Design an enzyme around this catalytic site. Structure first.
Site, PDB file in Angstrom:
ATOM      1  N   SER A  64     -13.500 -15.340  -0.539  1.00  0.00           N
ATOM      2  CA  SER A  64     -13.237 -14.883   1.192  1.00  0.00           C
ATOM      3  C   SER A  64     -14.465 -13.768   1.782  1.00  0.00           C
ATOM      4  CB  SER A  64     -11.721 -13.826   0.956  1.00  0.00           C
ATOM      5  OG  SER A  64     -12.034 -13.103   2.629  1.00  0.00           O
ATOM      6  N   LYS A  87      -4.763  -9.122   6.153  1.00  0.00           N
ATOM      7  CA  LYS A  87      -6.476  -8.916   7.133  1.00  0.00           C
ATOM      8  C   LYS A  87      -6.020  -8.852   8.905  1.00  0.00           C
ATOM      9  CE  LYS A  87      -8.520 -12.683   3.721  1.00  0.00           C
ATOM     10  NZ  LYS A  87      -7.712 -12.078   2.837  1.00  0.00           N
ATOM     11  N   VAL A  96       3.468   3.253   3.049  1.00  0.00           N
ATOM     12  CA  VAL A  96       4.803   1.806   3.231  1.00  0.00           C
ATOM     13  C   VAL A  96       6.725   2.200   3.446  1.00  0.00           C
ATOM     14  CG1 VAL A  96       5.841  -0.279   3.339  1.00  0.00           C
ATOM     15  CG2 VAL A  96       3.398   0.453   3.402  1.00  0.00           C
ATOM     16  N   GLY A  97       6.645   2.853   2.107  1.00  0.00           N
ATOM     17  CA  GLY A  97       8.450   3.609   1.865  1.00  0.00           C
ATOM     18  C   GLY A  97       8.751   2.823   0.957  1.00  0.00           C
ATOM     19  N   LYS A  98       8.734   2.963   0.319  1.00  0.00           N
ATOM     20  CA  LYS A  98       8.703   1.695  -0.827  1.00  0.00           C
ATOM     21  C   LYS A  98       9.599   3.124  -1.795  1.00  0.00           C
ATOM     22  CE  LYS A  98       4.633   0.612  -2.039  1.00  0.00           C
ATOM     23  NZ  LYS A  98       3.750  -0.051  -2.223  1.00  0.00           N
ATOM     24  N   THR A  99       9.121   4.421  -2.115  1.00  0.00           N
ATOM     25  CA  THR A  99      10.574   5.332  -2.588  1.00  0.00           C
ATOM     26  C   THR A  99      11.494   6.006  -1.950  1.00  0.00           C
ATOM     27  OG1 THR A  99       8.772   6.644  -3.493  1.00  0.00           O
ATOM     28  CG2 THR A  99       9.926   7.776  -3.482  1.00  0.00           C
ATOM     29  N   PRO A 153       0.615  -1.254  -0.016  1.00  0.00           N
ATOM     30  CA  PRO A 153      -0.133   0.245  -0.036  1.00  0.00           C
ATOM     31  C   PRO A 153       0.584   0.774   0.008  1.00  0.00           C
ATOM     32  CG  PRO A 153      -0.135  -1.229   1.921  1.00  0.00           C
ATOM     33  CD  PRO A 153       1.008  -2.220   1.073  1.00  0.00           C
ATOM     34  N   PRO A 154       0.337   2.529  -0.425  1.00  0.00           N
ATOM     35  CA  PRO A 154       1.257   3.672  -0.321  1.00  0.00           C
ATOM     36  C   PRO A 154       0.996   4.359   1.291  1.00  0.00           C
ATOM     37  CG  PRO A 154      -0.624   4.021  -1.332  1.00  0.00           C
ATOM     38  CD  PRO A 154      -1.211   2.699  -0.713  1.00  0.00           C
TER      39      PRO A 154
HETATM   40  N1  LIG Z   1      10.627   2.456   8.609  1.00  0.00           N
HETATM   41  C1  LIG Z   1      10.598   3.682   7.630  1.00  0.00           C
HETATM   42  N2  LIG Z   1      11.262   4.316   9.136  1.00  0.00           N
HETATM   43  C2  LIG Z   1      11.614   6.409   8.037  1.00  0.00           C
HETATM   44  N3  LIG Z   1      10.114   6.250   7.562  1.00  0.00           N
HETATM   45  C3  LIG Z   1       9.352   5.608   6.964  1.00  0.00           C
HETATM   46  C4  LIG Z   1       9.625   4.364   7.117  1.00  0.00           C
HETATM   47  N4  LIG Z   1       8.507   3.769   6.669  1.00  0.00           N
HETATM   48  C5  LIG Z   1       8.464   4.906   5.635  1.00  0.00           C
HETATM   49  N5  LIG Z   1       8.568   5.763   6.209  1.00  0.00           N
HETATM   50  C6  LIG Z   1       8.284   7.779   5.679  1.00  0.00           C
HETATM   51  O1  LIG Z   1       7.747   7.039   3.834  1.00  0.00           O
HETATM   52  C7  LIG Z   1       7.618   8.335   3.441  1.00  0.00           C
HETATM   53  C8  LIG Z   1       7.565   6.975   1.964  1.00  0.00           C
HETATM   54  O2  LIG Z   1       6.524   7.098   1.138  1.00  0.00           O
HETATM   55  P1  LIG Z   1       6.119   6.019   0.460  1.00  0.00           P
HETATM   56  O3  LIG Z   1       5.323   5.020   1.047  1.00  0.00           O
HETATM   57  O4  LIG Z   1       7.438   5.861  -0.172  1.00  0.00           O
HETATM   58  O5  LIG Z   1       5.079   6.724  -0.830  1.00  0.00           O
HETATM   59  P2  LIG Z   1       4.929   5.912  -1.714  1.00  0.00           P
HETATM   60  O6  LIG Z   1       4.984   4.543  -2.206  1.00  0.00           O
HETATM   61  O7  LIG Z   1       3.615   6.820  -2.155  1.00  0.00           O
HETATM   62  O8  LIG Z   1       6.116   6.844  -2.703  1.00  0.00           O
HETATM   63  C9  LIG Z   1       8.626   8.690   3.653  1.00  0.00           C
HETATM   64  O9  LIG Z   1       8.653   9.498   4.453  1.00  0.00           O
HETATM   65  C10 LIG Z   1       9.951   7.796   4.619  1.00  0.00           C
HETATM   66  O10 LIG Z   1      10.441   9.235   5.715  1.00  0.00           O
END
Ligand SMILES: Nc1ncnc2c1ncn2[C@@H]1O[C@H](COP(=O)(O)OP(=O)(O)O)[C@@H](O)[C@H]1O
Ligand SMILES: Nc1ncnc2c1ncn2[C@@H]1O[C@H](COP(=O)(O)OP(=O)(O)O)[C@@H](O)[C@H]1O
Ligand SMILES: Nc1ncnc2c1ncn2[C@@H]1O[C@H](COP(=O)(O)OP(=O)(O)O)[C@@H](O)[C@H]1O
Lengths: 75, 496, 491, 87
Positions: free
Chosen positions: B400, B443, B108-111, B105-106
């Protein structure tokens, strides 16, 4: 914006129905911080071609730090 | 004139003789013409392209471990899967295999994670959003081997011709408006998305690595160690102030936000910071501002969404189903009604035909068990049945929350209220057995994040149940069932 | 430069006058240069010679694919007549099987069995085929057409027939090319090919594998080529045979070996990560006990050591063409008005199978102990999951019959059994097709006792005899003999 | 590519192919069977230089084509109560 010298984050956006003072807040912020007001509504070399629109406005005010509005992105 | 720069840039012989090919034409045409200047800037595209100068990779994975765990908190089941790839990347100099795909999901921190891998190996970072470009970014980095991210491939659907940028059978040579082929090998890729709706040619070369949500303890440590410092330094709050205690952050997470990520938590913390700064400049009395779990309502607003369950279990029809949706995990209130009529069903709410088959399955569950529930035995033609499923469920997830419909029908017929702290899920047979379902971790995170305290899962998921690592299990009273009679004995607040 | 090579080593006459025609267009422009270079870079000679030592081709097919003896013998027949006659102008090899068998690699092991160059063309500015011809540059390539289950669509039959391969036109290359002397090998996941193509193709059935055969494949041809792309070098990593038996039995259940490749690849990844993050160990040994430390608990299981008291639920065998497949047919009997109800995505062929089965049950109310009024006072719901094909629909008819006798009399079907067949009104049991593909599925899922019709007895002398070595098979001919085996009480 | 000496197929081999390996009014499946039988004879020539005159009778064919696919007519149990074969 007072303590940090230069916010690099996101931008103030003003969304409202047509009629509330969303244009006049450009005037009020402009004479609130001290900077200059420039409004730019929305809707290369050649023959003789002008520069870009934004730098045409930056030449229009002639200062480095304006309050450069951007009206009506929806239009 | 101009050749004395490109003669030392060391492009290979093909682009060298093309560069000299239009170059001597340029030196023998008028040096101030318009088309001549088009060729000048055309060569200026080719001064940009870095045909050499690999940036050095770093092989010691100990500091790769110590450079991942210093920036992101707790993605322990992901960092192993990322250090697989950096381990084989350490020994073998050039992997030609599949590519890391990050799906969750958006928020989470993938970027940020693809930004962190670039710090891990040593190579640079250029992000390429998706809704010539690629040589513009390869020219923009000025180096041979970047970490060229490809974000939101799911929001991409040149149409989709990037599949020749991925496979090594094509990456020895990629030309488009430059018409000299580039060696796009040794350009490591990481691709991200928000669902596994990736186009079927692209999915061949992509290792799916899942990034599920975060829980309240995990979000609490994220905000306490990695969000409040970067927010306190992007607004330049001085050190001796803004003590945000833990219970305040727990009330922000529990009451003021609902997402599997931490995107909205950044909005709330940033708004908290600048309201605190405004209360530091509009007064000179106080300097140390403390915000506990009480005074947020005097500081941030009103508790926008609900968390607790003192919520009147006398709802006759609706139960709470869980749903492994496209955007991850989600709560879901499935409702049924029984009106007088002729016996006809009514589908509502993105019910594909598989859920129709499970509706008639649950109908035969009820009709098989008519008399030992006290139901009028001829209900299937005196009284019509309307069943409602709010959308969100992927069609693979589908049946489900099948037994949510069965408990919803038993509850709607006998008038027995479903107790409303029960997050049922499952997949029903005809005769009254409850089949397994996948994606149990989404879930359960959604069943914990909404504060549900009793979850019914099938019996044949005592296998994934141990692999939920955190204390999710420790405060949720998860207990499996296998027949429909263990469901009807529990999720109704009367015996039957 | 340009002019000194337009003869192009006895390039034929037509493209010589065409090539000189746009060369004198060049005399009176960059797209003209490229348009010359396309017609110069496509080949016009240099047949890469075949290797007529057919025993050598026997020796080179056994080094790349383990145990496809029927498929290998058929391929070597086509290469024998392909060796004697220079050009077979007959039907093309058609490799059909479930995904993850050595299709898309068998064709790679043909190209180094004759000598011609391998070219793959997935089926999911000059023409595409001549673009590939210019990619390889030889007069006699091997041009694999893959995924015929998936530029106009059916217009490739001019590449297959004799009448359109002595000369092949193009929309944007203007001349005629001879696509003869170009051996084709065509692969597909399934059988439902568009109709003109299905006649020009001789179908070769790559079936599924078994546990022993996957064990030997993983012990000879999978672990080395996975090691050498990850450079684990001979003593850094050993895997017991029981560990691969736990990967085959537990953590995947699929007729191919693609999932076994994914799990073994993951296993090598985590082994490398243990070898660089640690420095005490250098030899990692993996048995059936260390294995779940490196992966999940399970994904699927097998065994049928569960409870068996599943009234009205037998385990039919389904001949989907994407692998043979198990199936859990379920029926119920509720109080009602006799109105029959069928569900489960299939049409009307199951209707006549069901009504046949219900007449079979109603003829035997006395010696089964059923109140004979059930056909009008008790509604019946009969369910079968969606995995099947339109043909072999009335398979698992006696699955429905045993399901109805079980749910009416309240007699539990023993859960280890698995049935198949087609039922008629007298209780006779007709033959069924695809018996190997179903019995491999019943071998892989852990089924002990299988019932087949008596008139498929001769097809047991085609099965690789490790499969029959583990299945207590009973052929039946009457449904009254099904009802002494499939249930667990006398009737 | 079979010249006139090396493969000889009897009458009874063809009667076994027709009676046991095909069911239609035409001769298309007879062509597929004799085609596949001939190239199996070619494989049993080029893989063994000893034998040349490969002979097939109505006994040595099930190693070439496998077991009988379809069955022949009525010599089986004639009970078959309430069934009757119609045209
Ligand atoms: N485990 C983590 N530790 C530190 N920062 C996190 C963590 N998870 C998420 N973040 C924060 O979440 C943001 C990234 O959002 P992201 O999921 O990349 O958005 P998108 O998916 O739309 O690119 C960043 O600001 C980051 O600092
Ligand atoms: N709070 C206020 N006090 C005084 N004047 C106001 C206020 N709000 C709106 N106005 C008047 O309304 C007008 C606002 O124009 P506006 O609606 O912003 O134009 P636009 O069409 O660009 O939105 C101004 O002339 C301003 O004087
Ligand atoms: N009989 C076999 N012997 C050895 N390897 C095999 C065999 N069958 C399949 N493979 C392996 O399958 C892998 C590739 O899968 P592939 O054959 O392309 O299946 P698909 O065409 O369904 O993708 C290769 O590693 C190949 O070695």
């Amino acid at each position: 914006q007072s303590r940090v010298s230069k916010i690099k984050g996101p931008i103030l956006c003003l969304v409202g129905p047509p009629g509330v003072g969303k244009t006049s807040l450009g005037q009020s912020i402009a004479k609130a911080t001290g900077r200059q007001y420039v409004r730019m509504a929305l809707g290369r070399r050649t023959i003789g071609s002008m520069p870009g629109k934004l730098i045409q406005k930056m030449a229009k005010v002639g200062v480095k730090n304006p309050l450069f509005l951007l009206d009506e992105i929806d239009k | 004139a101009l050749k004395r720069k490109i003669e030392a840039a060391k492009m290979p012989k093909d682009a060298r003789e093309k560069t000299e090919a239009e170059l001597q034409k340029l030196k023998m045409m008028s040096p101030m013409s318009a088309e001549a200047t088009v060729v000048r800037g055309y060569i200026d595209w080719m001064l940009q392209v870095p045909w050499n100068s690999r940036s050095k990779v770093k092989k010691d994975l100990v500091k790769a471990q110590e450079v991942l765990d210093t920036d992101h908190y707790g993605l322990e089941r992901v960092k192993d899967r990322i250090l697989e790839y950096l381990a084989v990347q350490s020994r073998v100099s050039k992997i030609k295999g599949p590519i890391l795909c990050l799906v969750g999901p958006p928020g989470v921190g993938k970027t940020s994670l693809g930004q962190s891998i670039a710090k891990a190996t040593g190579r640079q970072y250029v992000r390429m959003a998706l809704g010539g470009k690629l040589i513009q970014k390869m020219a923009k980095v000025g180096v041979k081997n970047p970490l060229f991210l490809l974000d939101e491939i799911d929001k991409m659907a040149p149409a989709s011709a990037l599949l020749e940028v991925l496979d090594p059978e094509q990456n020895v040579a990629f030309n488009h408006y430059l018409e000299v082929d580039y060696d796009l090998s040794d350009v490591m890729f990481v691709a991200t998305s928000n669902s596994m709706n990736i186009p079927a040619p692209l999915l061949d070369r992509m290792e799916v690595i899942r990034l599920s949500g975060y829980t309240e303890d995990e979000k609490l440590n994220i905000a306490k160690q990695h969000l409040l410092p970067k927010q306190f330094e992007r607004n330049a709050i001085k050190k001796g102030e803004l003590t945000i205690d833990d219970s305040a952050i727990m009330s922000i997470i529990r009451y003021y936000t609902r997402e599997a990520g931490v995107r909205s938590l950044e909005r709330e913390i940033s708004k908290l910071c600048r309201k605190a700064v405004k209360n530091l400049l509009m007064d000179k009395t106080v300097k140390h501002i403390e915000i506990n779990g009480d005074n947020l309502k005097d500081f941030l607003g009103v508790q926008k969404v609900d968390y607790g369950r003192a919520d009147t279990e006398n709802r006759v029809g609706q139960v709470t189903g869980l749903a492994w949706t496209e955007v991850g995990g989600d709560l879901l209130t499935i409702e049924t009604a029984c009106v007088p009529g002729k016996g006809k069903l009514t589908y509502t709410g993105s019910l594909g035909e598989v859920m129709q088959e499970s509706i008639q399955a649950a109908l035969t569950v009820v009709r098989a068990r008519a008399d030992k529930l006290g139901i009028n035995p001829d209900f299937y033609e005196k009284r019509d049945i309307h069943v409602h499923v709010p959308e969100g469920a992927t069609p693979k997830d589908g049946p489900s929350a099948g037994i949510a419909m069965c408990t919803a029908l038993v509850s709607c017929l006998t008038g027995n209220p479903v107790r409303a702290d029960v997050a049922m899920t499952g997949e029903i047979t005809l005769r009254g057995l409850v089949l397994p379902i996948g994606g149990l971790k989404e879930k359960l995170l959604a069943a914990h994040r909404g504060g549900i305290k009793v979850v019914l899962i099938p019996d044949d998921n005592k296998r994934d149940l141990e692999e939920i690592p955190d204390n999710v299990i420790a405060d949720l009273e998860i207990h499996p069932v296998k027949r429909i009679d263990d469901v009807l004995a529990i999720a109704l607040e009367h015996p039957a």
